[PDB]
């Protein structure tokens, strides 16, 4: 499956693609403002994610740091990134279908649209100014808007026991972006797409 990753932001982002225990494609690349990077994701990929990293520095060998989304200091991500990270999430070829969503469960750093480029389903988007509007206690000094689990580490925010409800904090994310997950047990906003669809992830879509 192809994922075209497009940076419409006015600032550089470092795109990242991982399934948690491995890179997807090269795992990460710099995208200047306007640039597009197309990756290939193996069919059957379960639990894949794409995200943006901001304010990154890497040496010649691909080692460095990012202020949001850092994945172990690597340009080419092998693992998931450090919150806050708006997440494009997907599982491909799962009994004949693909499944996509955007999640704010790990916070928000960069607005994103995640849409198919092939027929048969809709895209999803979280493009509101969540950083500018972020509650004081959730603001990350490094940049971005943390989720409450990251800040406060309680069973209720982290849904540790699989029993949790919405919270003041999850409702903020849900209000700004109704079409993304705001906490672990949120009413799903997952889209079912035809098996082997292709996609475009656009940072700063509006």
Residues found near Na ion in the complex (CB under 5 A): 89, 91, 103
Shortest separation between residue 65's beta carbon and Na ion, angstroms: 27
Q: Which is nearer to Na ion, 75 or 164 (CB)?
A: 164
* SS3 category, 65: strand
- C-beta separation of 189 from 99 below 8 A: no
- C-beta separation of 135 from 172 below 8 A: yes
Shortest separation between residue 62's beta carbon and Na ion, angstroms: 27
Shortest separation between residue 194's beta carbon and Na ion, angstroms: 16
Q: Which is nearer to Na ion, 70 or 89 (CB)?
A: 89
Q: Which is nearer to Na ion, 17 or 56 (CB)?
A: 17
State how beta strands 2-7 and 199-203 pair.
parallel
Q: How far apart are CA 30 and CA 80, in angstroms?
A: 17
Shortest separation between residue 186's beta carbon and Na ion, angstroms: 8
Q: How far apart are CA 126 and CA 177, in angstroms?
A: 5
Distances (CA, A) of 169 to 86, 98, 110, 165, 203: 16, 30, 18, 11, 24
| Backbone dihedral region for residue 171 (phi beyond 0: left; psi -120 to 50: alpha; all else: beta) | alpha
Q: Which is nearer to Na ion, 30 or 91 (CB)?
A: 91
Q: Which is nearer to Na ion, 75 or 88 (CB)?
A: 88
Shortest separation between residue 144's beta carbon and Na ion, angstroms: 19
């Amino acid at each position: 499956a192809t994922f075209e990753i497009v940076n419409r932001c006015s600032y550089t982002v470092w795109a990242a693609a991982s399934k948690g225990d491995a890179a997807l494609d090269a795992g990460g690349r710099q995208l200047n403002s306007g640039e597009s990077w197309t990756i290939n994701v193996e069919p059957g990929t379960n639990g894949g994610k794409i995200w943006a990293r901001t304010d990154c520095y890497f040496d010649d060998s691909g080692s460095g740091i990012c202020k949001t989304g850092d994945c172990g200091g690597l340009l080419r991500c092998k693992r998931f990134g450090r919150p806050p990270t708006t997440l494009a999430e997907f599982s491909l070829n799962q009994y004949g279908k693909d499944y996509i969503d955007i999640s704010n469960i790990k916070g928000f750093n960069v607005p994103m649209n995640f849409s198919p480029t092939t027929r048969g389903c809709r895209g999803v988007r979280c493009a509101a100014d969540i950083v500018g509007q972020c509650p004081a206690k959730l603001k990350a000094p490094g940049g971005g808007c943390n989720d409450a689990c990251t800040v406060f580490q309680t069973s209720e925010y982290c849904c540790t026991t699989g029993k949790c409800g919405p919270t003041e904090y999850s409702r903020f994310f849900k209000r700004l972006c109704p079409d993304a997950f705001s906490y672990v047990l949120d009413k799903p906003t997952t889209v079912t797409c035809p098996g082997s669809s292709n996609y475009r992830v656009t940072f700063c879509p509006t």
